[PDB]
Amino acid sequence: HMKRYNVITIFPEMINEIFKYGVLSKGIDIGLFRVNPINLRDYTEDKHKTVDDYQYGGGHGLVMKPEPIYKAIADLKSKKDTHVVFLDPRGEQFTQKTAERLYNYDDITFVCGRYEGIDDRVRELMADEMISIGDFVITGGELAAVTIIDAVARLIPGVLGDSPNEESFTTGLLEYPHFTRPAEFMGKKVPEVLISGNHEEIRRWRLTESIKTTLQNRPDMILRKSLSREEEQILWSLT
Amino acid sequence: HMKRYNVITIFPEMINEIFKYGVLSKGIDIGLFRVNPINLRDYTEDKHKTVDDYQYGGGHGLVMKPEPIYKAIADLKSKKDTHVVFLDPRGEQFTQKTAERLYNYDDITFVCGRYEGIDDRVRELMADEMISIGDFVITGGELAAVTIIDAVARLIPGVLGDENSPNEESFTTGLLEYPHFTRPAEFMGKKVPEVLISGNHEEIRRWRLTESIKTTLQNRPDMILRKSLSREEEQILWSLT
Numbered sequence A: 001h002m003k004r005y006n007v008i009t010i011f012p013e014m015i016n017e018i019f020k021y022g023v024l025s026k027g028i029d030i031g032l033f034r035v036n037p038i039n040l041r042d043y044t045e046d047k048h049k050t051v052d053d054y055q056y057g058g059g060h061g062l063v064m065k066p067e068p069i070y071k072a073i074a075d076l077k078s079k080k081d082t083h084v085v086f087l088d089p090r091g092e093q094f095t096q097k098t099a100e101r102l103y104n105y106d107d108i109t110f111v112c113g114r115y116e117g118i119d120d121r122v123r124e125l126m127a128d129e130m131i132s133i134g135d136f137v138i139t140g141g142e143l144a145a146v147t148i149i150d151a152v153a154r155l156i157p158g159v160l161g162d163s164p165n166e167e168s169f170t171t172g173l174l175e176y177p178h179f180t181r182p183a184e185f186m187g188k189k190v191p192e193v194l195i196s197g198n199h200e201e202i203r204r205w206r207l208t209e210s211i212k213t214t215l216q217n218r219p220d221m222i223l224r225k226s227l228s229r230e231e232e233q234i235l236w237s238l239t
Numbered sequence B: 001h002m003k004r005y006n007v008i009t010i011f012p013e014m015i016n017e018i019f020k021y022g023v024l025s026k027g028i029d030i031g032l033f034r035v036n037p038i039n040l041r042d043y044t045e046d047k048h049k050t051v052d053d054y055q056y057g058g059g060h061g062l063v064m065k066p067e068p069i070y071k072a073i074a075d076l077k078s079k080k081d082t083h084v085v086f087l088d089p090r091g092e093q094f095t096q097k098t099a100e101r102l103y104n105y106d107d108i109t110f111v112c113g114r115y116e117g118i119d120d121r122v123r124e125l126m127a128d129e130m131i132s133i134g135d136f137v138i139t140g141g142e143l144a145a146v147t148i149i150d151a152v153a154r155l156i157p158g159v160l161g162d163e164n165s166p167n168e169e170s171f172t173t174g175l176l177e178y179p180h181f182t183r184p185a186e187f188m189g190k191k192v193p194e195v196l197i198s199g200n201h202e203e204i205r206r207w208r209l210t211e212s213i214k215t216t217l218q219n220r221p222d223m224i225l226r227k228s229l230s231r232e233e234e235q236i237l238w239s240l241t
C-alpha cells in the first residue's frame, strides 16, 4: 500500500513547502508515498480559536491545549486506522533502527508541539509512542516530523535511484569517503585505487576506511557491531 | 551586530520558506539573527552548471563536486569570518551540548550535501568540523542545517519570550523534563495534577523534579548514569527504585 504520513501542526503550509524539494518530491509525484498536513487550528471551537494557553503551575509559558489535538487525531482515525507518534524529547531517540521499524506502518500520524510542549493528557489518551529527533531541543515538532518522514520514506523501493543498502548506520558503521571529478583538486588526488583498481581492491579500501572512520569518530558503534572475521582483522590492524 | 547562519544548498528557497514560520521567524524580523541561503548553483563555472557528478569507484551514484562548494565557501570567507560545518553522518552527533558550543560563534556556514555525499577533499580543505543530525540518514543536509539553526538560534536571549524558558528544559539540565498541562482543568475525565493547580511554588518544584527524574529513569536511564545528581536528586532517585 502507499505509505501515508499525517502531520498535525499549526503550520501545515510549511510541511507542504518542504516536500516539493529533492528526490522525495518525485516519489510523492508518482504515488510511492504521501504527506498529509493537518491544520490544527481547524479543530478549535472557541471564539479566540485557541490551540495553546498558559500552562498550569505558574508563569505564562504556553502549552498546546488537549482538545484540538484530540479532535484532529480522532478525525484521522474516524476515516482510516493510523499509528500515532507524539514528537517529544522524552521519546525514543530516533535512529536508523527506528526508521526501519516505522517503515512497516502504512499510516503514521505525527503530532507537532510548540512552545513548552503538549498537554500530557492528550498524549496519554492518544499516543501509541513518543519519539525524539535527538538529544536536543527545537522550537517545534515540524522539523522533527519531516526529518523522520525523509528518513523513512527514502527506504521505499523506487524512491531513490538504482543505494541505501550500504550506508552509514544501516551497516552499523560510518561510511567510507566519496570523491568525484576532477581527479586533482587543489593538490589533493583522488585515491588511485578508486580510479584504476578492480572491484575487490575498491571494496577492501572502502571497508578499511569505513572501519577507520568509525573507530576514530564513533568507537561506541564499533562496540555494538557484530564484526565479520575480515572486519575484525582490519580493526585489529588499526589498533 | 547579530548571529548569522549561511546555508550552502541547491535548494535556497527551501531554506527561505522554512524560516517564515514560528517564533524563529519573529526573531529574524526584529534582527536578533539572520539566515542566508547560499545558492550552490551560483558557484558553478562550467557550461552545464554542474554541482554533482558520477563518483569514482564504479557505478553512477552521484557525489557533490568539490569546486562549487569550495568557491561558495571562499566567497563567504572573503566577506566575513565564518565557522564551517559540513553536515555529514560521520560528524559529531548533534546534542544540546553541541548547540551550546555552536552558540558561541557569530557566523556559521552549513554545507548541505545530496545523493551519496560530498567529495571529501573539499571537506578536508574547508571544514572546521562535521556534524551529524543523528544516527540515521536523510536525503539531504537541508533539514539537518535548519534543525541545528533552530536549536542554536532559540538560545539567543529575546528570541523566546515568556512562552518558554530555555534554562530549564530537557537535555539542557541533563534530564528529561516533567509533564506539562494547560486549560481545561478536566479533560475527558482526566484531571490536571492538583499540585499544579493549587500547590505553592516549592511543592510544584518538588513534584516536577520528581516526575522529571521518574521519566528520565524510565525512558533514558543512560542519562541518569552520566548526570552528577544533586543531593536532593539522589534521594528522589533512591525513593523510587
Ligand SMILES: C[S@@+](CC[C@H](N)C(=O)[O-])C[C@H]1O[C@@H](n2cnc3c(N)ncnc32)[C@H](O)[C@@H]1O
Binding pocket: A087, A088, A089, A090, A111, A112, A113, A114, A115, A116, A117, A118, A131, A132, A133, A134, A135, A136, A137, A138, A139, A140, A141, A142, A144, B164, B168, B169, B170, B176, B177
Ligand atoms: C520547545 S519544545 C518543548 C520541550 C519541553 N519543554 C522539554 O524540555 O521537554 C516544543 C515542541 O517542539 C518539539 N520538539 C522539540 N525538541 C524535540 C525533540 N528533541 N524531539 C522531538 N520533538 C521535539 C516537540 O513537539 C515539542 O512539543
Ligand SMILES: C[S@@+](CC[C@H](N)C(=O)[O-])C[C@H]1O[C@@H](n2cnc3c(N)ncnc32)[C@H](O)[C@@H]1O
Binding pocket: A166, A167, A168, A174, A175, B087, B088, B089, B090, B111, B112, B113, B114, B115, B116, B117, B118, B131, B132, B133, B134, B135, B136, B137, B138, B139, B140, B141, B142, B144
Ligand atoms: C543520502 S546522504 C549521503 C550519506 C552517505 N552516503 C553515508 O552513508 O554516510 C546525502 C546528504 O544528506 C546529508 N545527511 C544525511 N544524513 C545526515 C546526517 N545524519 N547528519 C547530517 N547530514 C546528513 C549530508 O549532507 C549528505 O551529504
Ligand SMILES: [Cl-]
Binding pocket: A127, A128, A129, A130
Ligand atoms: Cl507513549
Ligand SMILES: [Cl-]
Binding pocket: B123, B127, B128, B129, B130
Ligand atoms: Cl572535519
Ligand SMILES: [Cl-]
Binding pocket: B225, B226, B227, B228, B229
Ligand atoms: Cl556521574
